[PDB]
């Protein structure tokens, strides 16, 4: 159990990494929404001012 929990933490850490570096703008919105983690369809389009 203890081992599997540590692995979960490791997986969580890996997940945070993948979000920040592959999915550019999301740090601001991580705080509030508790519940249903639905895989928000990351519309790529917005960034480029240009």
């Amino acid at each position: 159990d203890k081992y599997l929990s540590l692995e979960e933490q490791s997986t969580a850490a890996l997940t945070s990494f993948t979000k920040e570096h592959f999915f550019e703008g999301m740090s601001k919105f991580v705080e509030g929404s508790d519940e249903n983690f639905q895989l928000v369809q990351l519309n790529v389009n917005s960034f480029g001012e240009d």
């Binding site: 081992y3 540590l6 692995e7 850490a13």
Partner: protein
């Protein structure tokens, strides 16, 4: 062993001779694995695995912090000349001439 299987899958060059070496490598792992399970107590082996898992998470966090800093690192910063040559340490890959990376 797993990495070798991964590299082979990406490089489409199915070189037809690499299977016999794979098996030997699996067997070698099994034997070694068995020896480990016979030489050490299961609680010790599990503890060792927990520790190894801590290290991986730590390394991932360090990379993120450095990598995230790189994203937040854009060029005003002046070439500070710091001195000391120890050994070489040209680059993690081995060499780094390239950074003309002018914007």
């Amino acid at each position: 062993f797993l990495r070798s299987l991964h590299d082979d899958s990406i490089s489409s060059s199915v070189h037809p001779g690499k299977e016999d070496l794979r098996s030997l490598s699996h067997q070698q792992w099994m034997s070694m694995a068995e020896k480990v399970w016979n030489t050490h107590t299961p609680n010790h082996i599990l503890a060792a695995l927990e520790r190894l898992t801590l290290n991986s998470t730590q390394e991932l966090k360090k990379l993120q912090f450095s990598q995230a800093a790189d994203l937040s690192k854009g060029p005003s910063c002046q070439l500070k000349e710091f001195s000391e040559p120890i050994t070489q340490s040209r680059s993690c890959n081995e060499s780094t001439h390239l950074d003309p990376q002018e914007t």
